[PDB]
Paper text:
Here we describe a mechanism by which an HLA-B*0702-specific acute myeloid leukemia phosphoneoantigen, pMLL747–755 (EPR(pS)PSHSM), is recognized by a cognate T cell receptor named TCR27, a candidate for cancer immunotherapy. Here we describe the crystal structures for TCR27 and for HLA-B*0702 in complex with pMLL747–755 or similar peptides. Our data show that non-covalent interactions between the epitope phosphate group and TCR27 are crucial for TCR specificity.
Author numbering:
A (entry chain B): 0 to 241
B (entry chain A): 1 to 201
Amino acid sequence: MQVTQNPRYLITVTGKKLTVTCSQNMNHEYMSWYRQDPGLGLRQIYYSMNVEVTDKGDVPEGYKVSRKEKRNFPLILESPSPNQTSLYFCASRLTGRVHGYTFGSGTRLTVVEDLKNVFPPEVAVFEPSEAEISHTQKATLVCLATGFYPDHVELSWWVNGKEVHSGVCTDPQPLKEQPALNDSRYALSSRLRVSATFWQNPRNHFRCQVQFYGLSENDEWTQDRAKPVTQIVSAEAWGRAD
Amino acid sequence: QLLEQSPQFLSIQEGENLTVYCNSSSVFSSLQWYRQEPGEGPVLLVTVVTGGEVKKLKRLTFQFGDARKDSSLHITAAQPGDTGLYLCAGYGGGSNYKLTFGKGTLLTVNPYIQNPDPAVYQLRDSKSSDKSVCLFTDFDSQTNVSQSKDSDVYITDKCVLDMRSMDFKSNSAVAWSNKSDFACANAFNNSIIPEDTFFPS
Ligand SMILES: [Cl-]
């Protein structure tokens, strides 16, 4: 069972017509768009009971859809507004009450008032405390990604060039750095914990990688600083013998 | 067109049983339960249609009241992998064919910590000694990490990591700032932490 939403991450400048696509080949009659926002839960935008049949959900304003084909259900934002920054889910199902949804994996859309709002992350690795090492015989590294906007990032750890998941926890979501602001930049932390002896080997290499999804050649850049394109930003450290 | 789910938030210790609730004032054609992991599509658990039914899917038990407006989800012996947002949604009801979600119960199932050793450590930037973070770590699962009242201080929520090769889990939270007053001794003072929390020099 697959409902396919692409792209996973999307930045658009406000006012520039946008279409988010959704497809399923399960022959489902009923398809729907939802938005998910902090505090407000999942809210239904539009739904379609079948080909050429569409109906408003609870929050249709600023959106349109069509259902020319059974497999596809595009969501169109004619003049996207910052208030349409959200996480969008497409879902499909058979018609009858007994049948439930299969959801797509989401599209994170940020509508930016101005491209100068867009910033890549800065990334730092904080080295383990000698006190932790003494007290626990373990060593925790902390990675901090800071200053980024939008919040379209994926953090991973790499030890001796190999991706690791054991010993890792990353905050489930970023925090706003200036929560009063509608375009606040974001920070994200993660921990990687290893044995003290592993940290103490200078042959061991630790890297925190942050994939940022940013602008492309499509996007006009006029600021003096470097264009905040999709890019990886990393911080790294070697094990310490001293 | 409104589904109320209670509790909004639920932190549960591994191994406990728990019940979450979904109540609306509207009469729906069916109520549908989903589980969602962060930023991922919700996944269907079950649909209930018949007033009074009881559906059991392993440790999960779903009930739909005789009057067909109340549903509960009960979980036996909660496991950390049960963590997620549990969503109920109402379909239909005779006027229209909307499918309307409640705001969910965000369930966090906290893993058992065998040997807590609560401590706050200072860590310095690999690139810049004068930049640092504070790490509160190794606290037990029931410890609650609060936010700061200082807007110059950022404090994450707690996160559990699993050192698989050592079969060891540990909680931690991170705090950082720019201020002159910022010492790791005080970073987590908005939280109620153990008296024996270790503070190295
Ligand atoms: Cl009932």
